[PDB]
Amino acid sequence: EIRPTIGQQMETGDQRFGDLVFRQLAPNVWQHTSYLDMPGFGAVASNGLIVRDGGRVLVVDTAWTDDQTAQILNWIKQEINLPVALAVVTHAHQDKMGGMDALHAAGIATYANALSNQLAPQEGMVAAQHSLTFAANGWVEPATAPNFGPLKVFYPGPGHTSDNITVGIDGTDIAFGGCLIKDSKAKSLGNLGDADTEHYAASARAFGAAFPKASMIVMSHSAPDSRAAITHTARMADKLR
Ligand SMILES: Cc1ccc(-c2cccc(S(N)(=O)=O)c2-c2nn[nH]n2)cc1
Ligand SMILES: [Zn+2]
Ligand SMILES: [Zn+2]
């Protein structure tokens, strides 16, 4: 098995498929995990989501690479056998957008914050084909997120990056914080190279206020946790201000 240097380990309830791991979180929600192997350091896990909405599937975040992302699509084909309607990617970094070309080759409509699409070239990413825009309180403008089904997109403010977005899964108790949120036992806020340290704490708390009844918080680099992930992330961020 893959024992990542960074990220959660494989545990009971996990399915290894090719180079990836899949974990069912709810009847209609699965977490995908892919790994970036760093020489002399080891693997770094990154998580995203797969949501079934009736006769179609929705994806949140790519894997690190196009091949890993094509493996996500193969898992969906084998395990669900329904078409992927769209994907939402949560900021312009490799772990979240590294596999855009695989989604495009498959003919899947891709969405990201307009700012993620604008930053994508400098970040070495391929932009999504559609841009999401947001209100002054962070909620997505609904005309920019057509037919998103249960995905409720929220821009919490600058934090891990200035473009980071989050997604609540309506009809469930799950919300996805991406790379903004760290687990309740995390020791750091991860890579702060592109972060807004002044606004981070407020952005983390805004995510919690946007999805006040979500009890399962999913994030990029740890296993799903309680709402203490939000509070602990904000407390660590209070130290940067
Ligand atoms: C403990 C830890 C976890 C993850 C990383 C990481 C590794 C590679 C790439 C990124 S990103 N999205 O490019 O900035 C990150 C990261 N840091 N915080 N969120 N994601 C580093 C340390
Ligand atoms: Zn990032
Ligand atoms: Zn990350």
From TrEMBL:
Coiled coil regions in record: none
Keywords, comma-separated and alphabetical: Antibiotic resistance, Calcium, Hydrolase, Metal-binding, Periplasm, Plasmid, Signal, Zinc
Residues involved in Ca(2+) binding: D66, D101
Chain sites annotated for binding Zn(2+) 2: D95, C179, H221
Enzyme class, first EC level, given as a word: hydrolase
Gene Ontology terms for molecular function: hydrolase activity; metal ion binding
Domain of life: Bacteria
Gene Ontology BP terms: antibiotic catabolic process
Binding sites annotated in the UniProt record for Zn(2+) 1: H91, H93, D95, H160
Presence of keyword Protein transport: no
Record bears the keyword Ribosomal protein: no
Cysteine sulfenic acid (-SOH) modifications at: C179
Subcellular location: Periplasm
Domain (Metallo-beta-lactamase) ranges: 45-221
Protein EC: 3.5.2.6
Pfam family of the protein (one): Lactamase_B
Catalytic activity: a beta-lactam + H2O = a substituted beta-amino acid
Cofactor(s) named in the record: Zn(2+)
Record InterPro entries: BlaB//VIM/IMP-1, Metallo-B-lactamas, NDM-1-like, RibonucZ/Hydroxyglut_hydro
Complex and partners: Monomer.
Protein family (similarity comment): Belongs to the metallo-beta-lactamase superfamily. Class-B beta-lactamase family.
UniProt cross-references to NCBIfam families, sorted A to Z: bla_class_B_core, bla_subclass_B1, blaNDM
Protein name (record): beta-lactamase
Organism: Klebsiella pneumoniae
